[PDB]
Structures are given as structure tokens and as C-alpha cells.
């Protein structure tokens, strides 16, 4: 249900004044990127609110493994390419096995808050954007980026703080939280997208 310090504040900006966001139309939509020249995702993006979650008990089921950019029960998708990269699972689920939603390091730590903020604010809806930064020819980014904001039922921003010493506010309230796509006892090959201890 809730999380500790998990709150927002009204900025008064109506969406409008933010070119980082998808139009508010008061529809969910999923936007995502193009798959590039290297096949590689270019970013995801969501605007929903809590009704529109796909909320599953249980999902579907060395080289590394591929991660979502914007998690499941937000966009339902299942193996789409343009939703998915190369990633440790420190930084997916915030732990090498198993979950830890309060590390955050990990993208957990934020969705599962993102998720509280939203069933706590039903007629609210959240803009969700993941996109993985690469280098040169890179197969597996080194870094991904989160950018949330909340929009009300008149269009206007709400920022959302997760308590985390990580999120970066813009001059409009959008928050832009940067993490490492490595893992604290590996070696990642971006380029070739492998891993050993």
C-alpha cells in the first residue's frame, strides 16, 4: 500500500509548459521509441492512471538478461523489443536474487512507489518516461533514465518525490532519477552484452 515519504506537491504549470511529456489527452497511452540502426531500444513511455495497471499475480516464464524499461504492471507488455534492454538485476529488481524495492539502485525502488503514489491518487495520472543511454555501439546501456511527473484531472504538474538522494527536479517539477546499469560483484561487456564475476 504506502511507503514512507512518498509524496507530491502542486506545482500550478500546466503540462503544456513541459516539452519532456506525452500530450494529456486523459487516455492512458503507451509511446515507444523506434528500435535503432543496432536493434537496440531507444526509450518507453506511459501515462496512466491506477485503473489502467496490468496487475498479474504472476507473469510469463554468462549472457546477459533483458530488463523492461517501463515495468509490467504499468504497460502489461510481454517481450516487446522496444521495451526492453540489457540489464543487471541489481539494477532491475534492486538485488542479485530476488527483490529489494529499498535499494535505490535498483528501478523497483521507484516504481513500487510510483505504484503506491498512483492507487493513492486515483483520479491522478502519472507520465512516465524510461530511456536507456548508450555509447557508441554499445548493446547494453550504461545508463537508464526515469523521468516522472504527476498530472491532475485540470493538467497541471504535480512533482512527485520518492525519497530518494537521487531525483533531480526541473524547472517545471518533471523528476529525472539517473542509474547505473552495473552490479556490485560483476563485469558487464557492453558491448557484447555478457557478464563474469
Request: charged share 20%; glycine share 6%.
Amino acid at each position: 500500500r504506502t511507503y514512507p515519504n512518498v509524496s507530491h506537491a502542486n506545482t500550478h504549470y500546466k503540462n503544456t509548459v513541459s516539452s519532456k511529456l506525452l500530450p494529456f489527452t486523459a487516455n492512458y497511452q503507451l509511446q515507444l521509441g523506434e528500435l535503432d540502426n543496432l536493434n537496440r531500444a531507444t526509450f518507453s513511455h506511459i501515462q496512466l492512471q491506477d485503473r489502467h495497471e496490468t496487475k498479474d499475480v504472476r507473469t510469463k516464464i554468462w549472457v546477459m538478461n533483458r530488463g523492461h524499461l517501463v515495468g509490467y504492471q504499468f504497460c502489461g507488455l510481454n517481450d516487446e523489443p522496444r521495451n526492453l534492454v540489457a540489464m543487471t538485476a541489481w539494477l532491475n529488481t534492486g538485488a542479485y536474487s530476488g527483490a529489494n524495492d529499498s535499494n535505490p539502485e535498483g528501478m523497483l525502488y521507484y516504481e513500487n512507489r510510483l505504484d503506491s503514489w498512483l492507487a493513492l491518487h486515483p483520479d491522478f495520472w502519472l507520465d512516465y518516461k524510461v530511456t536507456p543511454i548508450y555509447s557508441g555501439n554499445e548493446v547494453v546501456p550504461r545508463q537508464i533514465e526515469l523521468q516522472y511527473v504527476g498530472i491532475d484531472s485540470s493538467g497541471e504538474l504535480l512533482t512527485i518525490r520518492l525519497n530518494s538522494n537521487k531525483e533531480s527536479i526541473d524547472e517545471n517539477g518533471v523528476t529525472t532519477v539517473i542509474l547505473e546499469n552495473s552490479a556490485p560483484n560483476i563485469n558487464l561487456d557492453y558491448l557484447n552484452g555478457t557478464a563474469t564475476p
